[PDB]
Design an enzyme around this catalytic site. Sequence first.
Site, PDB file in Angstrom:
ATOM      1  N   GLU A 196       0.544  -1.190   0.013  1.00  0.00           N
ATOM      2  CA  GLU A 196       0.227   0.412   0.125  1.00  0.00           C
ATOM      3  C   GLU A 196       0.448   1.773   0.203  1.00  0.00           C
ATOM      4  O   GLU A 196       0.126   2.899   0.035  1.00  0.00           O
ATOM      5  CB  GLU A 196      -1.080   0.467   1.239  1.00  0.00           C
ATOM      6  CG  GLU A 196      -1.841  -1.049   1.334  1.00  0.00           C
ATOM      7  CD  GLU A 196      -1.268  -2.167   2.008  1.00  0.00           C
ATOM      8  OE1 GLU A 196      -0.579  -2.368   2.406  1.00  0.00           O
ATOM      9  OE2 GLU A 196      -1.813  -3.625   0.982  1.00  0.00           O
ATOM     10  N   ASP A 237     -16.041  -0.409  11.500  1.00  0.00           N
ATOM     11  CA  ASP A 237     -16.713  -1.377  10.597  1.00  0.00           C
ATOM     12  C   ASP A 237     -17.661  -2.158  11.233  1.00  0.00           C
ATOM     13  O   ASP A 237     -17.390  -3.091  12.427  1.00  0.00           O
ATOM     14  CB  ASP A 237     -15.462  -1.604  10.003  1.00  0.00           C
ATOM     15  CG  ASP A 237     -15.052  -0.588   9.245  1.00  0.00           C
ATOM     16  OD1 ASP A 237     -14.537   0.012   8.945  1.00  0.00           O
ATOM     17  OD2 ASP A 237     -13.659  -1.362   8.566  1.00  0.00           O
ATOM     18  N   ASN A 240      -9.897  -0.062  12.179  1.00  0.00           N
ATOM     19  CA  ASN A 240      -8.653   0.648  11.408  1.00  0.00           C
ATOM     20  C   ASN A 240      -8.142   1.506  11.233  1.00  0.00           C
ATOM     21  O   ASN A 240      -8.786   2.959  12.135  1.00  0.00           O
ATOM     22  CB  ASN A 240     -10.146   0.556   9.739  1.00  0.00           C
ATOM     23  CG  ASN A 240      -8.324   1.203   8.843  1.00  0.00           C
ATOM     24  OD1 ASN A 240      -7.531   1.584   8.758  1.00  0.00           O
ATOM     25  ND2 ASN A 240      -9.315   1.132   7.652  1.00  0.00           N
ATOM     26  N   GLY A 247      -7.542   6.015   5.111  1.00  0.00           N
ATOM     27  CA  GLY A 247      -6.746   6.703   4.721  1.00  0.00           C
ATOM     28  C   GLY A 247      -7.008   7.975   4.257  1.00  0.00           C
ATOM     29  O   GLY A 247      -7.876   8.624   5.136  1.00  0.00           O
TER      30      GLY A 247
END
Length: 310
Positions: free
Chosen positions: A20, A260, A275, A279
């Site tokens: 990533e 989530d 998470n 981003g």
Amino acid sequence: GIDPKRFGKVAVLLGGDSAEREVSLNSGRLVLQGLRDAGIDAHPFDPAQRPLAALKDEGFVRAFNALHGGYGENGQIQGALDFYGIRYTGSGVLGSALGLDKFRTKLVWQQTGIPTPPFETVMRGDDYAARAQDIVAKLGVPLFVKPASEGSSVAVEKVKSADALPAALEEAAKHDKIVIVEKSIEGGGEYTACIAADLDLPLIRIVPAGEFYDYHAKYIANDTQYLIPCGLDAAKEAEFKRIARRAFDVLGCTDWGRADFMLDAAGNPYFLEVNTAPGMTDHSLPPKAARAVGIGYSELVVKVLSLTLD
Ligand SMILES: Nc1ncnc2c1ncn2[C@@H]1O[C@H](COP(=O)(O)O)[C@@H](O)[C@H]1O
Ligand SMILES: [Mg+2]
């Protein structure tokens, strides 16, 4: 309204060696501009291409972590930064490592009353046919077969039939020594709760075009919807934001990231993961959630960095 001098000399950790690297380069370049737009003394720092000790030796006091995957997310760079006395955004060693371990995350959640899909485990070398029978008997079908964690080689698989489960188990167990098999949460929707300090960020409803939020829906399709408003009533939205924050907190994560979750047909939530490295591209979810409550990009980055003061 923080004097940008209070932040001192700031590194934006970006790039790295992981698969990533490119989302990280994108995110980090934007984060860097966001901080400099606020007059903060920020500089890029790619740990794949600069020696890490230079953070201490060049006098950086803190870092905005814009890395994703591998050492940037799993506790390894977190530990090294703590060792070198460099403050950083996001979670510390335990929270980072635990967040990537879906097995131990779910154990902690079950013990602390955070709802999560019922599940069983399968270990490499098990009698996969025998385990499959017992798991179907307990949980029914469909099932989600996933790494315990995490995502390394074998993609999450939705198993629809009892007879397909042994093969799915054997394949998953070839690439993680622990496999999670969760009850599929059906008949509701999928959501995420972004967390950024004490900001009141709205829930987002994630609407994949296909079966689930698979690799195709995340990275290939242009038609996944990310909806604000999420469609839930005010009371439920408040409730799930609160449970999301407790779900993060009980893992030792501190409040930058996303939680989530799925709802079932009765409207009950079941958390899937946290998470701790979301981003920060101009199409990423935290900036969208922030923009929905009037917080622009530079403001959001400054707020996240402010948590490293004191
Ligand atoms: N137990 C589950 N019930 C329903 N959908 C799930 C479940 N586990 C995973 N999914 C779906 O699969 C995607 C990827 O799984 P994961 O990375 O484990 O969250 C999730 O974002 C959901 O779309
Ligand atoms: Mg990731």
